[PDB]
Design an enzyme around this catalytic site. Structure first.
Site, PDB file in Angstrom:
ATOM      1  CB  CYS D  61      -0.913   0.005   1.242  1.00  0.00           C
ATOM      2  SG  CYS D  61      -0.084   0.147   2.874  1.00  0.00           S
ATOM      3  CB  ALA D  64       4.216  -0.369   2.255  1.00  0.00           C
ATOM      4  NE  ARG D  95      13.095  -0.695   1.940  1.00  0.00           N
ATOM      5  CZ  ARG D  95      13.442   0.577   1.852  1.00  0.00           C
ATOM      6  NH1 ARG D  95      13.530   1.412   2.856  1.00  0.00           N
ATOM      7  NH2 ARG D  95      13.586   1.035   0.572  1.00  0.00           N
ATOM      8  CG  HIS D 194       7.808   5.067  -4.046  1.00  0.00           C
ATOM      9  ND1 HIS D 194       8.036   4.216  -5.092  1.00  0.00           N
ATOM     10  CD2 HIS D 194       7.990   4.330  -2.921  1.00  0.00           C
ATOM     11  CE1 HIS D 194       8.334   2.994  -4.614  1.00  0.00           C
ATOM     12  NE2 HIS D 194       8.301   3.057  -3.298  1.00  0.00           N
TER      13      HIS D 194
END
Ligand code: CFM
Ligand code: CFM
Ligand code: CLF
Ligand SMILES: [Cl-]
Ligand SMILES: [Cl-]
Ligand SMILES: [Mg+2]
Ligand SMILES: [Mg+2]
Ligand SMILES: [Mg+2]
Lengths: 478, 519, 519, 478
Positions: D61, D64, D95, D194
């Protein structure tokens, strides 16, 4: 006797009925019920006899008394188990004779050095092997101060001569190389291994510094017979030094060749383990005119008696210092009794150990309000049973070299609340539902000597005796 | 001093000031070498120079990795129903044998001696034997008294077979009590040899005169050899029950080494029955699961019982478990069970999931010959390198087969195999070849400590697999054989790797950039 | 730089001199606080004044010890045969749920989303639900599609029941496929609540129209709730089989979370059959093994099934396992198997062998409420002190019950229980109360790291027991329930004590006077 | 197309036959076969579309993409997951965006800060909770440099106004407090997170130092879109300083708020992840006139191309320097290729990752003689597929946002020798017997960028492809 003594005399009869006739009549002389009016055992108990064959005795062997007990602890000497592999392997780091040092470099107590006899050594002898062995040790372990050769069973049997090797190697290295003829078939127990070892110390070690200068003081002593189990010797030495004494040597827990060599210059030898080191104390009395005295550092009653008696051998400054040391630790003793005595008083204990501890820990249990209902030794002599007699209530079962069968039968019938004994007994009695404390290794805790030890001792008896698991042996549907 | 609320044991009590001072004062009385000299000598013992001197030894043994025969005999003997181990010879041995097992299994161990003393080198120990068998019988009431010997008795040359026949004839011991015997000299081979010699005594005593017919009973016998993980006895019965193939372990001490703590002591529990041993020659075959030490047992199977003695490797790892199962299937004619295929595939899934952390890791290992060969094989199957492989009691034939296995694998290229070397030799190899990890018994903790003293960068962490295991609890309950045992070995190896990696990355602000949550 | 014969990964590559200089030089461009200030602030976070401020939080949550409902609903759904978990709502949720279980179990986790976006935010997700059930059926061919929700579908008020009714009326999902559903709002409760909510959905779907009769079938149903040790499902089936008492686990993911790596991917494997869930109401009774989270489950059992719902405690440790077996025996009329009595007694023996290393050890523990309650109770039974007990998702009624149980034990005198508190709260407690060890999941590694940075004397080691366990492999295969599980626990606790003591005493020449060989 | 391209178009038809006909026809447009002639994909593939409901996509999503990828890694800022507890928990430390710092004191990346929304917050909103939260954060975490608020699904849907809170708190705290509207229902995947994150950086961060004095160099550069997975950005930065460049900032692996605020002073922006950070690069070119370029530090071929093309932005000095960097690592690169190429050459690889790596790692695989036979992205855009065409062999299957069904069915048919993909795929393919490497987290290894990474990459690929366990999937008796 009283009603306990009578119950105990019928218990004895009931347990010995299982033995074949020879054995049965012999084993009856190895038990008795105590009478507070008697000062020596006389004809009531015999001890230091050969073990009955096949009964599952707890006893060990002479090598155990000599390598395992007396020499093993000396940290600055490498000790060679000379024979087949088994002996030094089973006894490698099993006894918690604590020391400080750099293992394999300046201290060697947890290494197992051995000549590992193969069949060829049996057939052709192991003396050339031993001489080469010592040369390889000097190359690889250059900081040893000295080397001891502990003979295992086959050595004397095949005709080896270790005294010739030791002499030749000691010149060659220019360090003491000490030969011990402590073959496991000699004697009946660990006890002769002690005796053999003291006799070797007498001849190969003790005279080494004769004639030579030493700066002495008036308060110089040696601790004789304390193997520093869990750091017991250190918890003892702290009080002696706080009293103003100078502990020149400790034999042999955290002990060195050097300290033993300086022992003949002390003013007083202090013997904890009578059984293992009375021989050498007696000899230093006779040859060097060094008096000696037994002492007991288990529990506050015994520590204060010992501190006062030891201080009494000196002068008024050390008598005052004994009183100060007692006074400094009185608050810690009072807090231990207030916390743990209520959790333990009333409880009954059965003790079975080697040659000293069965009597020596009784005052510590009695300071915690606990009562000893049976006490035995593995390998003590009649002079040890004599010294046990003052510390037993009337009608206490007192016994010698008991088989596993006997111990089991005594526990089932007496139903102690707690047992103190060795690793070979521990797991049998826990399965029976009886709290058990290892009283040779301190069950990996300790120290139990001294004022610092008594705290640990009380914590450990309380931990095991009152552990919540003891209530769960029976499934609740059962 | 101690405070009432927080009582300290030996560690850390002796860290307090008062004791540090006590130690400072005592050291002036020992004529201690200079700390600098000691540190120089420590440093030298960690070098290749010292390693060359160490490997020139011919006479001195330092920290052996083996024990003596009778220990093995005692363990074999415990695995038989209502049996009392009896060691003819000196009583020091028996205290040591009981202690040694007590500390490994945390359980009671019944063994008796006949207490031979100086009187027997001249007179022989027939009197000891006569009385010992009478008393042992009366007190412990065994059905079988399994007789082995200490080194005194071996040197002396006592004739067990004679003494035993004289004890029954004179009435010291009842004639319906079985008395198997074996000479177990401590100056030959090791505790694994003792186990095998004891097993040959039992087979002589129960089967010598039997007219057997292999395959009369559709079962297999299994013989483990000296084995100290309870789990390995249990997993074999479990797999055989899954295969639906009747089976008897000949010598199974797993019940008598694991009785319950329920208010009763039971000296005897479970164990191979006399019926199972007596009918042993009628099985299809007998599988010898540790082939390098079961030498005389192989002669029994083949020569006395006329069975194939199908060769099987120790069933440690994926491939050796597959082989054992195909062998059972081939000999019985039954299919491999689906639940075993499922377990095998879960093991494979574990090895796939953990392969990246193990691949290329270097291990040093020591132990008994069969154990060390089996663990080496499985390390090679995982893509790990057993770079330093040692067995103090192994021989040159075993060494040749080891080098053969290693030369055949991509993972055995840097591997060095050592026999008749001890743990002081192992200590020098850990300093000069520095594997990532070592696999061994509790005596390896002293090598770990030595490599950590040279520096944190040189520490070789011990992974505890083998015997004895004295400084951890209940590891003797684990399994190392079969697919279940291989799952235990894989999980132990990968978690050792991740434990070490966590420790090395746990320095806040310095190495904790790689202190990952997920691994 | 790298050498060809010694490739370093990240650690320890970045320890090399060139990267240490890179870091030193990067530091001049981050305008870093100076070292001294960062040390002052670090020390400040270890103090009681900081702890006081930390317990004043009423808005900020830092390092939570709980997850959201739908995770629990996915796990419950995975425990039924041929079932595909389907999370109605936003797709990021599902990517995360799959990853979270992938990393703990090291297994593939099947779950789909119906990908609601901004368009569904205004129209509602009905088109997503129709098309999502259609596509999922086609691709994956489940017998059951188990529907739960994400927080977006809850906030918009999607009428799930009506959506699935439309999908079935309008032919998006065949009549052959069952579609149980539950609302699982992330802003209520936690992952344990979602499991229970999902369980309720399955009960309604599969039994709401059944006319049942408790005891028509002589079996028990068992309900685990949210449980992530495969061993606990297997132990319960094993114990019931030894009791000879038919039983069905209702929700059992232990086969689908442990499929074999044999060349085939099996999406579906094992799990509770539709036949087992449909015949549930005819069992004697259903035992709810994590009582604090099986709240709606308890109402199904009593109000829908009219069964007793006999209270049982989580079966962790010796007394809780005895109580489960006595409950099974009295409900069933069958005797406790001798094999279970034998096992009990072996566990007792292990407790007695190891009691001197555990007695008086102080532990901090956190986790889900049933687990913390059961573990705390077992530590009390061992003579240990659970001094800091934390459960972020427990409620006040649970806290009252914990305090009652601690109040009744000698070992609970110094114990403090904390609910609605997180791991940053737990970190302060570890520095202020300093237990000997902490029991928790992999997030606890960061607290062990922080405590070590104050000093080696302040380190609190983690013992991994719980969920999730991401930095060790294959701990999900263990058992923690029943006597088998209690043995694992005892074994992990005492070997944690011994490993820490060996580390503390392994400094050559300094603390190795107490580096004993035997423990 | 060639035979391979034909087999792949026929595989595509077969795989899609299971889908309902509306979805089948939509999914046909997400896959194609490559043509080496082609410079643009044109109409041949579509991407960045919503996912098909119910198909088990690998996509995440917007949250994230924003919290997890872009802002998460910034070490000196605290990032608040604003909403219910789940999202921040699942993404906590998953991550491997490496950094150095003192966790919870000057660096806050592995801490999960959250406003743990309960039903009261959904009912009355969370802006008051958030404001209070920020106050508590400032008190307990005084060394933060800045604070971000990452919105989770419910924030936007309930009508909360975090931008007011953010302005208000920042003034009270005197540190940047940045509001991100990255609710997970927005967009179709990570990609929109992003973009949202880049626009937030453009408005709330980047201008903070405009007009402030900054000591520049002529070789100043910013690394853009390198998240330091396993220390990849440190492995990239050591080479750019070894060539004579000054890396003033890294976005955002081991990145700080200060470095991002200084970025507008550099001479050049080196963009590694085009997909996530092309928006701000383009913005800095428009507004500050800083040029940018894409590079690729995966494997020795791409490294030497990148270093030469970056150093051609400067002058002969830096141009020479690139040549000396390349020559000095040549021997290293040659011995890695000699060792591992032989073990790996000719094996076939299927890749499926997010938005950059599926094309970016191709050259490293080809430096070890391996071949790509299928390459896919979860959420790339048509410009990424454009950027993939040059590196593929004729007839290669090129696809977008594949379902699990599709991914398994391509694997079973193409039978790759190795798969590179994510954690959600890993344990599926391993059970199918296909060697698998985690190419998002590097399977807990790396770094893989730069010269030090290529040796790790080569070792890892070999370790997995040639492991002995892959020969054991089938029981020997079958
Ligand atoms: S059994 Fe001591 S005479 Fe000797 S090893 Fe223990 S009761 Fe010995 S006190 Fe001592 S440190 Fe001992 S505990 Fe005399 S040395 S042969 Mo087993
Ligand atoms: S799936 Fe990168 S566009 Fe993004 S987290 Fe992985 S292929 Fe992402 S390179 Fe990057 S560090 Fe990534 S590996 Fe662009 S940042 S949304 Mo999953
Ligand atoms: S009384 Fe030694 S354990 Fe024995 S069979 Fe020989 S190697 Fe083995 Fe004492 S000295 Fe030793 S311990 Fe016994 S043998 Fe004698
Ligand atoms: Cl051999
Ligand atoms: Cl609760
Ligand atoms: Mg036991
Ligand atoms: Mg798996
Ligand atoms: Mg820093």
């Amino acid at each position: 006797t009283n009603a306990t003594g009578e119950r105990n005399l019928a218990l004895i009869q009931e347990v010995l009925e299982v033995f074949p006739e020879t054995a049965r009549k012999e084993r009856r002389k190895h038990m008795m019920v105590s009478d507070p009016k008697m000062k020596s055992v006389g004809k009531c108990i015999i001890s230091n006899r050969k073990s009955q064959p096949g009964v599952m005795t707890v006893r060990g062997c002479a090598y155990a008394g000599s390598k395992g007990v007396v020499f093993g602890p000396i940290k600055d000497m490498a000790h060679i188990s000379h024979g087949p592999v088994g002996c030094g392997q089973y006894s490698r780091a099993g006894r918690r004779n604590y020391y400080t040092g750099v293992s394999g470099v300046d201290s060697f107590g947890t290494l197992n050095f051995t000549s590992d006899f193969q069949e060829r050594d049996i057939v052709f002898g192991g003396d050339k092997k031993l001489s080469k062995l010592i040369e390889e040790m000097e190359l690889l372990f250059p900081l040893t101060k000295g080397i001891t050769i502990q003979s295992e069973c086959p050595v004397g049997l095949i005709g080896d001569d270790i005294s010739a090797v030791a002499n030749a190697s000691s010149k060659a290295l220019d360090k003491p190389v000490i030969p011990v003829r402590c073959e496991g078939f000699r004697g009946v127990s660990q006890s002769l291994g002690h005796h053999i070892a003291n006799d070797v110390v007498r001849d190969w070690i003790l005279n080494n510094r004769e004639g030579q200068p030493f700066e002495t003081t008036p308060y110089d002593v040696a601790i004789i017979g304390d193997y520093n189990i869990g750091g017991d010797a250190w918890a003892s030495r702290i009080l002696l030094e706080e009293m103003g004494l100078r502990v020149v040597a400790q034999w042999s827990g955290d002990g060195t060749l050097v300290e033993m060599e300086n022992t003949p210059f002390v003013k007083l030898n202090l013997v904890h383990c009578y059984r293992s080191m009375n021989y050498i104390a007696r000899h230093m009395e006779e040859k060097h005119q060094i008096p000696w005295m037994e002492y007991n550092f288990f529990g506050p009653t015994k520590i204060a008696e010992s501190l006062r008696k030891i201080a009494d051998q000196f002068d008024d400054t050390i008598r005052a210092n004994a009183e100060a040391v007692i006074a400094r630790y009185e608050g810690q003793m009072a807090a231990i009794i207030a916390k743990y005595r209520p959790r333990l008083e009333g409880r009954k204990v059965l003790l079975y150990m080697g040659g000293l501890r069965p009597r020596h820990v009784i005052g510590a249990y009695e300071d915690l309000g606990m009562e000893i209902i049976a006490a035995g030794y593995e390998f003590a002599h009649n002079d040890d049973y004599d010294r046990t007699l003052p510390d037993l209530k009337e009608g206490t079962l007192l016994f010698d070299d008991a088989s596993s069968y006997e111990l089991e039968a005594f526990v089932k019938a007496l139903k102690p609340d707690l047992i103190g004994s060795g690793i070979k007994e521990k797991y049998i009695f826990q399965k029976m539902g009886v709290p058990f404390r290892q009283m040779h290794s301190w069950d990996y805790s300790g120290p139990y000597h001294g004022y610092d030890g008594f705290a640990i001792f009380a914590r450990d008896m309380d931990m095991t005796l009152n552990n919540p698991a003891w209530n769960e042996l029976t499934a609740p549907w059962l | 001093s101690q405070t009432i609320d927080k009582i300290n044991s030996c560690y850390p009590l002796f860290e307090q000031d008062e004791y540090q001072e006590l130690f400072r004062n005592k050291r002036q009385l020992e004529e201690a070498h200079d700390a600098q000299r000691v540190q120089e000598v420590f440093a030298w013992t960690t070098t290749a120079e010292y390693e060359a001197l160490n490997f020139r030894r011919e006479a001195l043994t330092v920290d052996p990795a083996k024990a003596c025969q009778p220990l093995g005999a005692v363990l074999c003997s415990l695995g038989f129903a209502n049996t009392l181990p009896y060691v003819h010879g000196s009583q020091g041995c028996v205290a040591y044998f009981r202690t040694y097992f007590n500390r490994h299994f945390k359980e009671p161990i019944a063994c008796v001696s006949d207490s031979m003393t100086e009187d027997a080198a001249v007179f022989g120990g027939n009197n000891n034997m006569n009385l010992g068998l009478q008393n042992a019988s009366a007190l412990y009431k065994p059905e079988i008294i399994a007789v082995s010997t200490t080194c005194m008795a071996e040197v002396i040359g006592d004739d067990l077979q004679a003494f035993i026949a004289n004890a029954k004839k004179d009435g010291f011991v009842d004639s319906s009590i079985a008395v198997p015997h074996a000479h177990t000299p401590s100056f030959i081979g090791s505790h694994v040899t003792g186990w095998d010699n004891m097993f040959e005594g039992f087979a002589k005593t129960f089967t010598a005169d039997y007219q057997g017919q292999p395959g009369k009973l559709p079962k297999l016998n299994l013989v483990t050899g000296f084995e100290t993980y309870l789990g390995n006895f249990r997993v074999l019965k479990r797999m055989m029950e899954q295969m639906a193939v009747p089976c008897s372990l000949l010598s199974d001490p797993s019940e008598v080494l694991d009785t319950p703590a329920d208010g009763h002591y039971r000296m005897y529990s479970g164990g191979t029955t006399q019926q199972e041993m007596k009918e042993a020659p009628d099985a299809i075959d007998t599988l010898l699961l540790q082939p390098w030490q079961l030498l005389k047992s192989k002669k029994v199977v083949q020569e006395m019982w006329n069975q194939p003695a199908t060769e099987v490797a120790i069933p440690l790892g994926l491939a050796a478990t597959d082989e054992l199962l195909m062998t059972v299937s081939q000999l019985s004619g039954k299919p491999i069970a689906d639940a075993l295929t499922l377990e095998r595939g879960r093991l494979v899934d574990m090895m796939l999931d953990s392969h990246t952390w193990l691949h290329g890791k270097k291990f040093g290992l020591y132990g008994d010959p069969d154990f060390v060969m089996g663990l080496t094989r499985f390390l090679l199957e995982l893509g790990c390198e057993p770079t330093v492989i040692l067995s103090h009691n192994a021989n040159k034939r075993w060494q040749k087969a080891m080098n053969k296995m290693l030369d055949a694998s991509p993972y055995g290229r840097d591997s060095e195999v050592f026999i008749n070397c001890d743990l002081w030799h192992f200590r020098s190899l850990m300093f000069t070849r520095q594997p990532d990890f070592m696999i061994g018994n509790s005596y390896g903790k002293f090598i770990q400590r030595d490599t950590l003293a040279k520096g944190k960068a040189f520490e070789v962490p011990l992974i505890r697999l083998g015997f004895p295991l004295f400084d951890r609890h209940h590891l003797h309950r684990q399994t190392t054989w079969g697919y279940e045992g291989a799952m235990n070995i894989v999980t132990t190896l990968v978690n050792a790797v991740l434990e070490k990696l966590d420790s090395d990355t746990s320095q806040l602000g310095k190495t904790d950039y790689s202190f990952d949550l997920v691994r």
